[PDB]
Design a protein around this ligand. Structure first.
Ligand SMILES: O=C(O)CNC(=O)C(=O)O
Ligand SMILES: [Mg+2]
Ligand code: NI
Ligand SMILES: [Zn+2]
Length: 331
């Protein structure tokens, strides 16, 4: 078995290897990459997502989210308070302000320490889930706006034609902006490209050990657990590396820098934070190996997790028994 310790692997494809996305994902899995839940892909040096980022300031963040924390430093939840719209230029200025900017630090480890120590005492503002792309249409390789669609994958593998579309989303981050512990909708893959700015630190649990994280989360967030049998789908709970170590949960961590891709694999729980002003783009995708994960994916039926139009069809076709109750949650 390749990669038996489930380490995060880092890949450096050549420009030739960067042509066929599906084939490279399948290559990575042949080397065991999926066992970690997360992989880093450094693009060939010849490749670029677009020519410059000089003209992005007028993108609108229609609903910036203020991430308010509750709990203790290593075990907290966050709630997203909606704020008034602002441009990316306005947001970058805010991110760079004295109130929100990254503190002085020695290296990524010292900044990680400061994040876990101090995150709860601040409420950074996140521009998340903004439909759109920053890839130039002329970028032909690993262009997250030109991937094959999950609906087309399901059709190719299973023969069923379904409605729905699959488009990317932009994320504008600042210091301390946080992504809570989650897997993807329907335990899909994700791919995330850090277009610009400061790094993003990731933590991940190997898929084969995801239930260990779930069991800890039910112990640590006991009222949330009683309220919903898949409450990590709410994307609000954080647990620090120190806490994970204290409870024997297997995990790994890695820092993504501008110009790098990360891939999350089916049922790879992940969480993380941004080091400073940055912009990422991400999208879900599928492969043949995903299908069985999609069939087994948990679902939130309490009604909090409230998810896309396109997830309907996935549930309907892959989880017909759940369909009924899950759609009661979504209506
Ligand atoms: O970058 C973020 O805030 C969150 N991204 C992801 O969870 C991802 O790409 O799967
Ligand atoms: Mg603009
Ligand atoms: Ni994710
Ligand atoms: Zn729920």
């Amino acid at each position: 078995a390749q990669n038996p310790n489930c380490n995060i692997m880092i890949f450096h494809p050549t420009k030739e290897e960067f042509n066929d996305f599906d084939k490279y994902i399948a290559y990575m899995e042949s080397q065991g990459a999926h066992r970690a839940g997360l992989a880093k892909i450094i693009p060939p040096k010849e490749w670029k997502a677009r020519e410059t980022y000089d003209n992005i300031s007028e993108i609108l963040i229609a609903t910036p989210l203020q991430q308010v924390a509750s709990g203790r430093a290593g075990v907290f939840t966050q709630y997203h308070k909606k704020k008034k719209a602002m441009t990316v230029g306005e947001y970058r200025h805010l991110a760079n302000s004295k109130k929100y900017q990254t503190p002085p630090h020695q290296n990524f480890e010292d900044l990680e320490r400061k994040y876990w120590k101090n995150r709860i005492y601040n409420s950074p503002i996140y521009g998340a889930d903004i439909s759109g792309s920053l890839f130039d249409e002329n970028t032909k390789q690993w262009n997250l706006g030109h991937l094959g669609t999950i609906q087309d994958l399901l059709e190719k593998e299973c023969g069923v034609v379904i409605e729905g579309v699959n488009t990317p989303y932009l994320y504008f981050g600042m210091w301390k902006t946080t992504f809570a512990w989650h897997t993807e909708d329907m335990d899909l893959y994700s791919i995330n490209y850090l277009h610009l700015g400061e790094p993003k630190t990731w933590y991940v649990v190997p898929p084969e050990h995801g239930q260990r994280l779930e069991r800890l989360a039910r112990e640590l967030f006991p009222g949330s657990s009683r309220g919903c049998g898949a409450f990590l789908r709410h994307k609000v709970a954080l647990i620090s590396p120190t806490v994970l170590k204290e409870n024997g949960i297997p995990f790994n961590r890695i820092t993504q820098e501008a110009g790098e891709f990360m891939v999350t694999f089916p049922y790879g729980y992940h969480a993380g934070f941004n080091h400073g002003f940055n912009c990422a783009e991400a999208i879900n995708f599928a492969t043949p190996r995903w299908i069985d994960y999609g069939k087994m994916a948990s679902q939130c039926s309490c009604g909090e997790a409230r998810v896309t139009f396109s997830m309907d069809a996935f549930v309907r076709i892959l989880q017909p028994e759940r369909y009924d109750l899950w759609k009661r949650g979504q209506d």
